[PDB]
Design a protein around this ligand. Structure first.
Ligand code: MG
Lengths: 748, 183
């Protein structure tokens, strides 16, 4: 078998996720005598059943493409990335069609202009990997064929998705022949960060929305202009945060500037004075001056042609939302509530907005039913009043965000008709915490959908390559996460029961969880209950199992916005912007989970129109050190980017492909002169068919041999054995012949 | 597809789409026939009127209520009122939408049998259900426990419910009514 003395294996180690070992005695069917670097010798148990991951030979190690490796597993990937990053400083790497980008914190020269002209024209394999090579593969496919092209970037927001997009756009600008898309888009970045980024337990300045830039090309492939869109914004953060989190930066940047004279009208307090900002208990981010980021946000608005009148509108509305948060209801009786007399937050909210105090005070505590012929003003419980107030705050914020994006688009557009576009998606990756909640559940459902699209695209490209190479295409195995998507989104799924429990009377997180267990507990292999608790459930995702706690879900999922409260706000006359937000029913009833599922279906409609190209970003160390690679963090990021599962899916197939001449060159050491023949293709077909017994392992394509995982390592090992033994025989013969001559010399 | 929700009674008919905040069609449930000799020629004399039409003309008409005491007591007029409800007043074909129908408890079984038979055969409704009025009042008022007292035209009935279980032995029914208050 493949286990021999003088062979290498990976062993699990809690300090560094895998450790290298050498085998001291050949295996034969319950313990191995394992060498190490950490001392000479060790005795290592096998487990009831398992053998360690066997290590690839060092011709394949450090290749530019992870699927050149003959064994494919987490240790080989982690090692190969670590050696490329640490030893050669090659941050870019390939995996199938994906480009893995490992973020150095140090700056590099490699982005410099000339390299743009060096990569341009070159087919994707003909050059070592770099972000320009994907930017070209898009630009070339756009020029060659009708279709638009898309580039999709995933990873924790520190990883540098924005830097990858920025350089892709520089590539486009420099090849296309420009003006001032790039400078404007990067000027927009601080605004979209300020209103869309957030601070999460694992990460400061996380981005809670998916942001899409459509770079527009003329029919001459001149850059016209750009168009921006945003998807999957999480509204729930606005009203509610977990411990050690903040809601969107802009509220803190606004409160930090309370001293400034133009803000004085807002009567802003300390950032933990209000109810929406205080709940996380974490007002100050370590190592940031918020007032400086405020000044940079304002200057970016000015640079995008939002006049100071509109900027004071934006901050006026945000201060309105903050003051609205403090409004506090007293219950008269269990089904009725009222606002106390001359309540200071409501008075300030009405002053800031212009709406007359009596109308807000009346509508916040009642709702209106109307048939066509009659209309009833009905009191509502303090809980329903609070839910309505929070839904109104979420609705104001979501419309303010959509408005600021409409103005950014107004700056980015240009008049010439767009012939085709190339579109660069910055999104968040798969996400898991000690505590997982409705936000993580929506993020994971979005990532399940994106991963489904990726898997289908890879499967299509590989079917086309197999039909091209005359292999039976029925062999290739397709792996489908549709059963999970159906678990989350189909009727009587998790989201659909959550929406039912919202409306059903006396709903709760306990009765929701009980409905989950009744509906799924043993009917679906992917749904599981944690044994020791009844308030949680487990979904087996693409990457990993994830416990989700129920305690947040129903409080966060509820939106309903009472039409009269909007009709009050829309009526206000004090300033232009607040009527301008709400300008153009059933949508008001929709829950946040349903608005999210609709936004994700819009995103999937936008991507399905287009041929994708992928980038993954991984964050190599937790502390921004320039080149330190932490194998624990990189393992977690490689799982969260689905690279390891992609590699698993690939390792099932034929991952490794060789051209007949390059094979013939390498294995001429194995080949015998009688086997050499006037047709090298037939020669290799014969030699290989002898060398590897089971034809299931390999296929003969028109121009390439295909191998299952390990077979190239098998050939390389038999080559190293044969070449070693032949070298031993020749060496011992030469040593004997010379020393025998020295024997004869001593005789003489 | 949004199911229809239809609530019949003596007195008003209330119908609308599920998920709406309030009923889309409300009209008194009457079928009326003329009782005078039509003198003008080309008037467009009509065999009978339903709902608001029968109310406006009513001085000319005999008005007959096809439901007394929550029981449908002539099926032709009731089927006319459903015809008017789906085609004229909601303007939506029943072959698209499930339908939900409402009845007072402790009614005869034949009333449910005939009402379902007419829904499947005569309107071809793809699916239907029949709910109890008192149970639905608890959904509307936002509770899973209470004793409902519900009194319309025709039947008055109490139904106690405790955490989503009815208590059939405690159900009470009475025939005091808006109608007997009128008489
Ligand atoms: Mg009734």
């Amino acid at each position: 078998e493949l286990y021999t003395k003088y062979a290498r294996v990976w062993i699990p180690d809690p300090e560094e996720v895998w450790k290298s070992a050498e085998l001291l005695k050949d295996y034969k069917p319950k313990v191995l005598q394992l060498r190490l670097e950490e001392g000479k010798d060790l005795e290592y148990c096998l487990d009831p059943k398992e053998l360690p991951p066997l290590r690839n030979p060092d011709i394949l190690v450090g290749e530019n493409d992870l699927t050149a490796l003959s064994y494919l597993h987490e240790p080989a990937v982690l090692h190969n990335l670590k050696v490329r990053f640490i030893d050669s400083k090659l941050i870019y790497t390939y995996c199938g069609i994906v480009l893995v980008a490992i973020n150095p914190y140090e700056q590099l020269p490699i982005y410099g202009e000339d390299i743009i002209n060096a990569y341009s024209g070159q087919n994707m394999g003909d050059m070592d990997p770099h972000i320009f090579a994907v930017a070209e593969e898009a630009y070339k496919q756009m020029a060659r064929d009708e279709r638009n092209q898309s580039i999709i970037v995933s990873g924790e927001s520190g990883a540098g998705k924005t830097v990858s997009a920025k350089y892709a756009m520089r590539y486009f600008a420099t090849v296309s022949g420009s003006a001032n898309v790039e400078e404007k888009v990067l000027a927009s970045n601080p605004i979209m960060e300020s209103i869309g980024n957030a601070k999460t337990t694992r990460n400061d300045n996380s981005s809670r929305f998916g942001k899409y830039i459509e770079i527009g090309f003329d029919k001459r492939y001149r850059i016209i202009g750009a168009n921006m869109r945003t998807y999957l914004l999480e509204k729930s953060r606005v009203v509610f945060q977990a411990e050690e989190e903040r809601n969107y930066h802009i509220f803190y940047q606004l409160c930090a500037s309370a001293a400034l004279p133009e803000f004085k009208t807002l009567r802003l307090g300390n950032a933990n004075y209000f109810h929406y900002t205080k709940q996380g208990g974490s007002p100050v981010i370590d190592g940031i001056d918020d007032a400086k980021e405020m000044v940079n946000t304002r200057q970016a608005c000015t640079l995008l042609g939002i006049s100071d009148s509109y900027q004071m509108g934006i901050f006026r509305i945000l201060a309105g939302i903050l003051h609205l948060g403090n409004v506090e209801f007293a219950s008269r009786d269990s089904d009725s509530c009222a606002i106390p007399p001359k309540h200071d937050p409501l008075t300030i909210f009405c002053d800031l907005m212009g709406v007359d105090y009596e109308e807000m005070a009346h509508w916040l505590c009642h709702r209106k039913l109307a048939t066509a012929t009659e209309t009833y003003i009905k009191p509502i419980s303090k809980l329903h009043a609070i839910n309505a107030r929070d839904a109104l705050a979420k609705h104001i914020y979501a419309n303010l965000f959509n408005w600021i994006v409409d103005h950014v688009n107004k700056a980015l557009h240009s008049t010439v008709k767009q012939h085709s576009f190339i579109g660069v998606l910055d999104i968040y990756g798969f996400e898991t915490f000690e505590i997982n909640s409705f936000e993580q559940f929506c993020i994971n459902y979005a990532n399940e959908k994106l991963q489904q699209q990726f898997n289908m695209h890879v499967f299509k490209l590989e079917q086309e390559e197999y039909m091209k190479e005359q292999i039976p295409w029925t062999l290739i195995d397709f792996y489908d996460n549709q059963p999970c998507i159906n678990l989350i989104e189909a009727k009587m799924g998790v989201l659909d029961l959550l929406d039912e429990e919202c409306k059903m009377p006396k709903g709760s997180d306990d009765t929701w969880a009980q409905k989950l267990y009744n509906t799924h507990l043993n009917k679906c292999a992917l749904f599981e209950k944690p044994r020791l608790s009844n308030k949680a459930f487990i979904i087996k995702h693409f990457a990993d199992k994830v416990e989700y706690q129920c305690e947040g879900f129903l409080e966060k999922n509820k939106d309903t916005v009472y039409e009269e409260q909007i009709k009050v706000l829309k009526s206000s006359k004090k300033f232009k912007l607040l009527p301008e937000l709400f300008q153009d029913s059933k949508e008001h009833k929709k829950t946040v989970g349903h608005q999210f599922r609709n936004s994700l279906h819009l995103l999937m409609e936008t991507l399905n129109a287009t041929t994708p190209h992928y980038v993954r970003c991984i964050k190599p160390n937790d502390f921004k050190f320039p080149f330190t690679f932490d194998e624990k963090r990189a393992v977690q990021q490689l799982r969260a980017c689905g690279v390891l599962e992609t590699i698993r899916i690939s390792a099932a197939g034929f991952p490794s492909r060789w051209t007949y001449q390059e094979f013939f060159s390498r294995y001429r050491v194995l080949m015998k002169q009688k086997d050499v023949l006037s047709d090298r293709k037939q020669t290799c077909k014969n030699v290989l068919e002898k060398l590897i017994l089971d034809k299931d392992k390999y296929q003969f394509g028109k121009t390439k041999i295909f191998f299952r995982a390990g077979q190239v390592a098998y050939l390389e090992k038999i080559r190293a054995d044969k070449l070693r033994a032949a070298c031993i025989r020749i060496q011992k013969t030469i040593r004997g012949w010379l020393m025998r001559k020295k024997y004869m010399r001593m005789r003489r | 597809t949004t199911a229809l929700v239809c609530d019949n009674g003596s007195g008003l008919v209330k119908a609308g789409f599920a998920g709406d905040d309030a009923p889309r069609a409300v009209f008194p449930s009457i079928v009326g026939r003329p009782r005078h000799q039509g003198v003008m020629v080309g008037m467009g004399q009509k065999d009978s009127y339903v709902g608001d039409e029968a109310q406006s003309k009513r001085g000319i008409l005999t008005l007959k209520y096809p439901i007394e005491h929550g029981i449908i007591t002539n099926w032709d007029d009731m089927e006319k009122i459903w015809h008017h409800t789906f085609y004229n007043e909601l303007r939506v074909a029943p072959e698209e939408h499930p339908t939900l129908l409402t009845e007072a408890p402790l009614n005869p079984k034949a009333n449910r049998e005939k009402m379902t038979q007419i829904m499947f055969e005569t309107f071809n409704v793809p699916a239907m259900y029949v709910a109890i009025q008192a149970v639905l009042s608890l959904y509307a008022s936002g509770r899973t426990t209470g004793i409902v007292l519900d009194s319309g035209d025709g039947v008055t009935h109490n139904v106690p419910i405790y955490e989503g279980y009815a208590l059939p032995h405690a159900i009470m029914r009475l025939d005091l009514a808006g109608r007997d208050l009128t008489d």
